[PDB]
């Protein structure tokens, strides 16, 4: 019967998931892991999100330049210089 055939597919999945339950966990699912435990260069294969401790050093791209000389033209257009004068 088709319903019995349904149990035919179910009693397959039970054994694999049963095997996976008692099978050794992958290094990813072991929590704390060590280089020897995992395959070498495994993290090169995997996307791991990690926090950084300091600022990422800025990159001088053109729009950072363009915004930067634009103001320099604005300061000099107004003759606004922070320059030391005779006292």
């Amino acid at each position: 019967s088709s319903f019995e055939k349904q149990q035919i597919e179910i009693r397959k999945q039970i054994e694999q998931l049963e095997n996976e339950a008692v099978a050794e966990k992958k290094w990813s699912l072991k929590g704390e892991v060590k280089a020897k435990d995992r395959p070498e260069d495994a993290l090169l294969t995997e996307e791991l999100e990690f926090d950084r401790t300091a600022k990422p050093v800025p990159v001088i791209t053109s729009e950072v330049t363009e915004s930067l000389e634009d103001m320099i033209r604005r300061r000099i257009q107004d003759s606004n210089f922070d320059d030391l004068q005779r006292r």
């Binding site: 260069d41 090169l44 294969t45 996307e47």
Partner: peptide, 21 residues
Amino acid sequence: TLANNVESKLRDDLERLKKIR
């Protein structure tokens, strides 16, 4: 032979790195 295998694994890492980027 082992060095060649390490080289091939490194190349695979390179292709995957291209895939990310």
